């Protein structure tokens, strides 16, 4: 399952993520204690003036000195005093009136002509007032300046705590995400390494590269952005809701009832996004494969003037990719951060509804600080939901990509790989009624049977489709024979390990392949068991290339794929040296000299091959001269060995070999 | 910087974006209301002036505003996302139209995986920045400015000011962070191309990597590459972890300044507790998005680097093999080389030296020589794959340069030495030289290249799906198809270039007979290592190094006692 596999990959790094979430919690603690400080400041400093007054300030925080006497209101007057029930200030419009008289009741603040006007409909002993305004005497809030400055400095201090912990959590999250991606990519490459050749044979090369690189990059984006934002948003929401429940429970309940809303939006987005994104990723893999094929074969795309028809084919994937992308506009325009604002304007409506309903009963004004804190927390709560929804889009895309990737790491047709080789083995090789058929009934080989005897050279010369390369494919276990046996030193190669079997044999494959590096790095394939065997094993058949070269062989660099800057015949001498460089017990030559002039080939290669004749060889040859002295020549016709024997016994027979030999001279 | 490189796109679809900007401005303006409405409602609540009628007014206003903003915001979201999709499409079309018309000299500097990246990945990044990046940038800028003006005019100009002075330093921090992030995204994007062509190299050469047991060294190299990439990304993560906390700290400093100074101001009798809430909602809506505007740079600069890569690919002047030449010849006629001294771009020594051979209107030319001797270096002069050298190649009397590349490639029928087939059917591959043949004409080409018999062996018979790079057929079945590919038409010049290297000494004789009968009067360029394939040639050139040593007909080169005679005796005795 995609979710279970992603979770297990996360569990591979369970300390970094736990530490990151703990650090982020420590940061969010201060980030959200801020507004609680604001509420405390508002409810005790700016609405403290409403308290009672009229003590002589015997001690504590001195007093306000309104007219000629000391005034302290509540907080620093809490020491045992005679507070009485007088000297209450009130606010009406922009005018602050000090009644300075025993106040009976309250509820409706109105002084008009210095009276008490109405008090919840009671009208209890209208009282004389006294206007103050702004500059008359505003030492009334003097005791609160110290508290405000202390709260400001407290939050300023908490900001640095937050900065340190935010750095820590961000760094840990990024490191964990990158480590997870590293592990996933390594696993993908290992699995591709243990894949049958059939998989690589009927699949475009660009499709495998697309799968691995592109889908792992999409999963990387997932882990490094989507999941990091998910964790941060979840912790922030967790903290904000915990704070909200500490202010009002019913309003907090209705505001928290939006989590089911987010779940439902996630489901509705996920359906359509999954379908359209699976289509989009399939089309993108097709695009990558087409790009690879076009670039690889560009030489004869232009020669045969296939550019317009090649542009037509590519534009049909580009147009289809665009079309399936434009089906995202409806979803991504109706379910983007847009809707979050609609929730923002609808969550504030509940705030106003609740607080107004409480106010009509003279209960919603009990704590304006609570309202301030609840507005700040709503703003904070709606800050991260935008990131949540953006990551919701990215998450659907990456879910599709991960589903694509894990369809590769599950494949149960893989092949066990016992890497270790063993000591040198005698070149004895045998076939026993080996019938092999590509794709079921189509048989390419029928009852093949032959044997080498530890030093003999087996020619195996036939016609252009007989199946001479299929024998090599069976011998190298690229393909498993469907009938018969193949044995090396009397043990079935199917009781071996493919690496163990292939360690015995060195092959000059048809269609030579060079790697991007140096020439000496191709003769060696970057193997430490080399020393200076490069020049010695290239001195054979390569004694004119490393001389004209501006660099001395191991420094001059081929380029991508087969060395584009090498002649087709020079790329086959490097493959021949590579095969000889890896000293094999059995040497397979699959038309190793098809692109090499007959002088170089015949003289040099044969002269320096006969000397090392204490070694079994297989020489798939269309040049019958290079196999004239083969100790046993086999004639393959329609996937069947029809004639056997050395050159003399095959010419005396006057058969297919005789015909070909007489024709080639 | 990023926008200017992107200015071509915006002045091409200006209604789709000017209307989006107008709608964005309208939604911002009508979103400036709810905060002030809430402030007024709270102020009314405190003074006991809140009535059910006021409640109805407020809920109705909020419903109308939210509905309007949603309706008229869905439209500009739909414009910007569609514009991003269109940008991706046009960029992909431009890229894949530039990759064609590009000659080998370009392709020997740029790797296939690098180009696949500079397509898929870079275009995805550019599309992401164009839609999401511009969206967020413009929306945030308009929101910030409108909030600033609203707070200044409706609340206070001294409390709005001094609540933004943390932003100047924020601008410098963003500048530094974005400037360093550009330099760490050109390498991050480049390292993706290095991974694409690393996997592509281990997939194409899977047989060689497995034939010699090397699956563990390949995995080790891949692991080392991944470790290097991880270290680079962790340097980037360190920079981002330094950047994010300062963003958050400046946001918190601005919030604290606003809140504390407003609380102080209420005592100076310059603000009402209702106005506080309004101001501290305005500033909150301004600053809280900066928790993500810091991350916006990670999309902007990724898009900038990706577009830089795409623009390096696109601003690659077509190699000196540019047609840029009208001429009225219509018939290749004679082909004369006169002092050709071509030198390959990645070479330091002359690859050809004073080549001075002539080919008449109907003549088979054999080319023999040693390996790496220049046999196919002469052929690639008529293929216009590389810049011309320091001589003349006068098709008839007209230099090869003054001949459009379309007409010349129509003249030439080419059989590459290295097989190049596509993942199509056999008939589809054969129908590459004509593209509009009847099944009768495709059969004639098959018959000429001794492939009629092998069709019976194939399971499908012209519907066999040769497979990727043609690996579903023997090596000599791939070659004969290629011969058919060149024999489907009737090219004035047929270039073979070792077209019988995989054929069983009897298919070779039949194909040579068929080509001799087919090209009796037409011009052919046969390059071979078996000198029995150019016995009929009117002129044989023997190469060595870059210059040609021997020349003449077959009977003339056996009287020279040179390389040709020695080769012939080595090959005619066995
Ligand atoms: C999930 C991961 C992330 C989690 C993130 C963490 C979540 C965010 C955490 C935030 C922590 C906030 C800390 C508060 C500090 C500043 C305020 C202060 O001290 O003064 C307050 C003290 O108030 C009182 O004494 C009255 C009772 C109410 C207490 C409210 C704060 C403590 C909440 C319970 C703490 C325990 C619960 C802890 C959580 C379970 C308010 O003062 P006031 O209103 O002026 O009081 C007088 C008002 N009057 C005059 C009208 C009468
Ligand atoms: C909680 C509610 C509040 C938060 C809502 C926010 C959630 C939205 C964001 C997270 C999405 C989670 C999707 C599920 C997931 O990842 O499971 C895992 C991957 O999916 P799965 O296992 O392949 O299939 C899912 C199970 N199913 C087969 C039944 C469909
Ligand atoms: C981040 C929090 C810390 C993680 C560890 C928590 C401690 C866990 C304790 C560990 C002790 C026990 C270990 C064995 C448990 C096996 C059983 C089990 O619960 O597994 C099932 C999980 O359930 C699901 O199926 C989850 C599917 C949805 C989430 C998938 C995406 C998670 C991405 C990654 C999320 C992180 C995002 C950040 C990535 C950059 C699957 O079977
Ligand atoms: C690295 C971790 C550090 C942790 C420190 C934690 C704090 C603990 C320290 C606590 C000690 C701090 C001093 C407390 C005040 C005592 C005197 C008093 O009450 O005077 C009233 C006189 O008030 C006026 O005169 C009003 C006019 C000036 C307004 C100043 C507002 C604050 C400015 C911004 C001040 C800087 C805000 C940012 C601070 C970081
Ligand atoms: C089998 C599983 C069992 C265990 C499961 C539970 C294990 C986790 C539970 C335990 C972890 C509990 C949290 C403790 C703090 C750890 C911090 C830390 O590691 O710092 C990291 C981040 O460091 C930074 O980058 C800076 C961090 C800011 C300072 C934090 C100090 C906190 C001290 C008060 C490391 O620094 P670095 O530069 O990334 O290297
Ligand atoms: C990815 C996103 C995740 C979001 C997760 C969100 C949570 C999901 C869970 C939802 C379930 C609902 C929780 C009910 C809790 C009871 C509240 C209660 O009794 O209130 C009182 C006690 O409560 C407190 O002390 C409040 C703070 C601590 C509990 C917070 C729970 C959240 C407070 O009453 P008062 O009037 O403040 O005094
Ligand atoms: O024609 C076009 C597809 O247009 C369609 O998508 C509709 C017509 C094809 C039907 C295929 C099913 C579409 C379901 C879709 C509903 C979603 C859920 C479907 C879930 C199965 C193809 O055009 P082009 O080739 O891209 O150019
Ligand atoms: C101690 C704190 C750190 C100080 C760092 C100081 C060094 C700062 C590092 C960067 C400065 C040097 C590199 C940038 C060059 C800019 C070129 C130029 O003229 O730009 C213009 C080119 O139109 C404008 O470019 P723009 O992108 O359109 O804007
Ligand atoms: C005046 C300009 C004339 C131009 C003539 C010359 C050009 C000819 C065009 C001619 C088209 C002229 C305009 C119509 C667009 C048709 C579709 C179209 O072209 O799409 C384009 C955008 O085109 C736009 O400009 C779309 C903006 C129209 C309003 C969007 C709906 C708002 C409703 C909500 C109101 C809610 C109210 C709520 C109240 C409470 C997009 O594609 P492109 O850019 O073509 O590429
Ligand atoms: C949406 C953003 C909100 C945050 C910013 C709020 C701005 C507050 C208001 C004003 C500050 C200035 C704003 C403009 C940006 C100046 C940048 C600058 O000077 O950089 C240059 C330094 O010199 C270098 O730029 P560069 O890119 O390194 O090249
Ligand atoms: C971290 C800093 C947090 C600052 C909190 C607000 C305190 C500011 C304050 O009391 O007003 C200060 C003035 O201030 C002005 O004249 C303009 C406002 C400046 C605020 C700080 C800018 C940063 C102090 O004003 P006063 O001396 O009371 O007169
Ligand atoms: N693209 C290239 N860039 C640089 N040098 C090249 C390039 N292609 C070939 N060369 C070199 O130029 C010389 C001539 O090569 P060319 O391919 O013409 O020889 P050739 O006779 O066709 O080879 P062969 O007989 O092997 O088929 C050789 O040294 C070869 O390695
Ligand atoms: Mg073969
Ligand atoms: Mg050649």
Structural commentary:
The complex is a heterodimer of chains A (665) and B (574). Chain A is 54% helix and 9% strand. By secondary structure, chain A is α/β, with parallel strands linked by helices. Chain A has 3 domains: 32-39 and 147-158 and 176-409, ABC transporter type 1, transmembrane domain (ABC transporter transmembrane region fold); 95-131, no CATH class; 429-663, P-loop containing nucleotide triphosphate hydrolases (Rossmann fold, 3-Layer(aba) Sandwich). In chain A, a hairpin with a 5-residue loop joins β3 and β4. In chain A, α2 packs antiparallel against α12 and α7 packs parallel to α12 (368-409). Chain B is of the alpha/beta class. Chain B has 2 domains: 2-314, ABC transporter transmembrane region fold (Up-down Bundle); 335-571, Rossmann fold (3-Layer(aba) Sandwich), CATH 3.40.50.300. Chain B has 22 helices and 10 strands. Chain B has a 6-stranded mixed beta sheet, sandwiched between helices. Chain B is elongated. The two termini of chain B are 72 Å apart. The interface between A and B is large, with 192 and 183 residues. Bound molecules: the ligand CCCCCCCC/C=C/CCCCCCCC(=O)O[C@@H](COC(=O)CCCCCCCCCCCCCCC)COP(=O)([O-])OCC[N+](C)(C)C (11 copies), adenosine-5'-triphosphate and magnesium ion (2 copies). The site of one copy of the ligand CCCCCCCC/C=C\CCCCCCCC(=O)O[C@@H](COC(=O)CCCCCCCCCCCCCCC)COP(=O)([O-])OCC[N+](C)(C)C has 8 residues of chain B, from α3 and α5. The PDB classes it as translocase. The entry lists the keywords transporter, lipids, membrane protein, translocase.
């Amino acid at each position: 399952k995609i979710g279970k596999t992603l979770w297990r990959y996360a569990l591979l790094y369970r300390k970094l993520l736990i530490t990151a979430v703990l650090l982020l919690t420590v940061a969010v603690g201060a980030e959200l204690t801020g507004p609680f400080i604001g509420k405390k400041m508002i409810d005790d400093h700016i609405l403290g003036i409403e308290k009672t007054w009229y003590e002589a300030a015997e001690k504590d925080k001195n007093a306000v000195q309104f007219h000629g006497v000391s005034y302290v209101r509540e907080d620093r007057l809490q020491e045992p005093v005679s507070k009485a029930k007088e000297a209450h200030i009130y606010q009406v419009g922009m005018a602050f009136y000090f009644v300075d008289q025993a106040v009976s009741f309250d509820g409706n603040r109105t002084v008009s002509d210095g009276k008490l006007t109405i008090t919840n409909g009671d009208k209890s002993r209208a009282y004389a007032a006294e206007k103050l305004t702004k500059q008359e005497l505003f030492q009334f809030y003097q005791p609160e300046i110290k508290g405000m400055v202390l709260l400001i400095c407290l939050y300023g201090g908490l900001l640095v705590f937050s900065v340190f912990f935010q750095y820590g959590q961000h760094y840990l999250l990024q490191m964990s995400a990158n480590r997870i991606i590293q592990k996933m990519r390594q696993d993908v490459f290992s699995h591709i390494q243990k894949m049958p050749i059939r998989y690589f044979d009927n699949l475009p090369a660009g499709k495998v590269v697309a799968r691995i690189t592109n889908d792992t990059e999409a999963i990387r984006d997932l882990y490094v952005t989507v999941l990091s934002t998910f964790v941060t948003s979840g912790i922030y929401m967790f903290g904000i809701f915990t704070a909200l429940f500490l202010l009002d429970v019913k309003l907090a309940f209705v505001c928290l009832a939006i989590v089911p809303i987010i779940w439902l939006w996630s489901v509705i987005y996920r359906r359509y996004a999954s379908y359209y994104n699976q289509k989009i990723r399939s089309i993108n893999s097709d695009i990558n494969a087409k790009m690879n094929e076009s670039i690889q074969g560009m030489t004869i795309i232009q020669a045969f003037r296939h550019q317009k028809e090649t542009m037509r084919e590519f534009e049909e994937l580009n147009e289809s990719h665009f079309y399936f992308q434009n089906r995202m506009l409806n979803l991504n325009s109706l379910m983007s951060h847009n809707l979050v604002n609609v929730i923002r304007n609808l969550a504030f409506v509940c705030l106003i509804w609740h607080f107004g309903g409480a106010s009509l009963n003279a209960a919603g004004i009990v704590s304006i600080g609570v309202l301030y804190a609840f507005v700040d927390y709503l703003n904070r709560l709606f800050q991260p939901i935008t990131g949540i929804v953006n990551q919701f889009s990215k998450l659907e895309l990456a879910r599709v990509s991960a589903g694509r990737v894990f369809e590769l790491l599950e494949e149960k047709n893989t092949e066990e790989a016992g890497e270790p080789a063993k000591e040198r083995a005698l070149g004895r090789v045998e076939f026993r009624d080996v019938s092999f058929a590509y794709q079921e009934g189509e048989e390419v080989l029928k009852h093949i049977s032959f044997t080498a005897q530890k030093g003999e050279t087996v020619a195996l010369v036939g016609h252009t489709g007989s199946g001479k390369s299929s024998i090599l494919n069976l011998l190298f276990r690229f393909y498993d024979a469907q009938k018969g046996d193949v044995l090396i030193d009397g043990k079935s190669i199917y009781n071996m390990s493919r690496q163990e079997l292939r360690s015995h044999m060195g092959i000059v494959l048809q269609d030579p392949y060079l790697f991007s590096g140096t020439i000496g790095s191709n003769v060696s394939l970057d193997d430490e068991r080399m020393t200076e065997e490069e020049i010695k094993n290239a001195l054979r058949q390569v004694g004119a290339e490393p001389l004209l070269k501006k660099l001395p062989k191991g420094i001059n660099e081929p380029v991508i794929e087969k060395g584009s800057t090498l002649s087709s015949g020079e790329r086959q001498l490097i493959s021949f040296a590579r095969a000889l460089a890896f000293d094999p017990a059995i040497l397979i030559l699959d038309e190793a000299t098809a692109h090499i002039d007959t002088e170089t080939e015949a003289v040099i290669q044969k002269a320096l091959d006969v000397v090392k004749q204490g070694r079994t060889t297989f020489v798939i040859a269309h040049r019958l001269s290079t196999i004239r002295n083969a100790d046993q020549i086999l004639v393959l016709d329609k996937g069947e060995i029809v004639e056997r024997g050395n050159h003399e016994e095959l010419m005396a027979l006057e058969g297919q070999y005789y015909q070909m030999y007489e024709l080639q001279k | 910087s990023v926008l200017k490189k992107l200015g071509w796109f915006f002045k091409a679809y200006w209604l789709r974006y000017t209307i989006a900007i107008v709608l964005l401005l309208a939604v911002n303006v009508i979103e400036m209301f709810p905060p002030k409405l809430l402030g007024n409602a709270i102020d009314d609540m405190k003074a006991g002036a809140f009535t059910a009628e006021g409640l109805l007014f407020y809920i109705g206003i909020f419903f109308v505003l939210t509905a309007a903003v949603y309706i008229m915001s869905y439209f500009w979201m739909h414009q910007l996302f569609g514009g991003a999709n269109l940008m991706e499409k046009i960029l992909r079309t431009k890229l894949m139209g530039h990759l064609l018309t590009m000659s080998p000299p370009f392709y020997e500097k740029n790797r296939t995986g690098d180009l696949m990246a500079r397509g898929t990945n870079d275009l995805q990044a550019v599309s992401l920045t164009t839609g999401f990046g511009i969206l967020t940038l413009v929306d945030s800028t308009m929101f910030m400015m409108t909030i600033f003006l609203t707070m200044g005019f409706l609340i206070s100009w001294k409390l709005t000011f001094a609540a933004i002075i943390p932003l100047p330093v924020m601008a410098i921090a963003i500048s530094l962070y974005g400037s360093k992030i550009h330099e760490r995204f050109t390498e991050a994007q480049n390292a993706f191309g290095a991974l694409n062509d690393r996997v592509l190299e281990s997939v194409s050469g899977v047989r060689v990597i497995r034939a010699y047991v090397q699956e563990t060294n390949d995995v080790r190299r891949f692991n080392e590459m991944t470790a290097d990439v991880y270290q680079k990304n962790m340097k980037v993560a360190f920079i981002d972890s330094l950047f994010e906390p300062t963003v958050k700290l400046l946001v918190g400093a601005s919030y604290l300044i606003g809140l504390g100074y407003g609380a102080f101001l209420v005592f100076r009798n310059e603000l009402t507790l209702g106005e506080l809430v309004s101001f501290n909602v305005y500033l909150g809506m301004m600053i809280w998005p900066m928790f993500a505007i810091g991350e916006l740079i990670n999309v902007m600069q990724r898009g900038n680097a990706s577009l830089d890569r795409v623009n390096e690919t696109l601003s690659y002047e077509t190699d000196v093999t540019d047609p840029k030449q009208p001429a009225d010849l219509k018939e290749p006629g004679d082909i004369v080389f006169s002092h050709v001294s071509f030198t390959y771009p990645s070479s330091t020594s002359d690859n050809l030296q004073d080549i001075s051979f002539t080919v008449r209107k109907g003549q088979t030319v054999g080319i023999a020589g040693k390996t790496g001797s220049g046999k196919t270096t002469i052929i690639k002069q008529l293929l216009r794959q590389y810049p011309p050298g320091e001589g003349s190649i006068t098709f008839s009397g007209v230099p090869i340069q003054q001949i459009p590349l379309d007409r010349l490639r129509g003249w030439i029928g080419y059989v590459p030495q290295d097989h190049l087939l596509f993942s199509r059917t056999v008939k589809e591959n054969i129908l590459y030289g004509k593209q509009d043949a009847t099944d009768k004409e495709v059969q004639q080409a098959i018959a000429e290249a001794h492939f009629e018999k092998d069709l019976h062996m194939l399971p499908s018979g012209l519907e066999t799906m040769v497979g990727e790079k043609g690996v579903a057929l023997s090596g000599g079945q791939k070659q004969r198809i290629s011969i058919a590919r060149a024999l489907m038409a009737n090219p004035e010049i047929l270039i073979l270039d070792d077209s019988l290297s995989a054929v069983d000494a009897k298919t070779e004789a039949a194909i040579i007979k068929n080509i001799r009968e087919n090209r009796k009067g037409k011009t052919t360029f046969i390059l071979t290592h078996r000198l029995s394939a150019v016995e009929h040639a009117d002129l044989i050139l023997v190469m060595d190094g870059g210059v040609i040593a021997e020349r003449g007909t077959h009977q003339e080169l056996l009287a020279n006692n040179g390389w040709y005679r020695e080769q012939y005796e080595r090959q005619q005795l066995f």
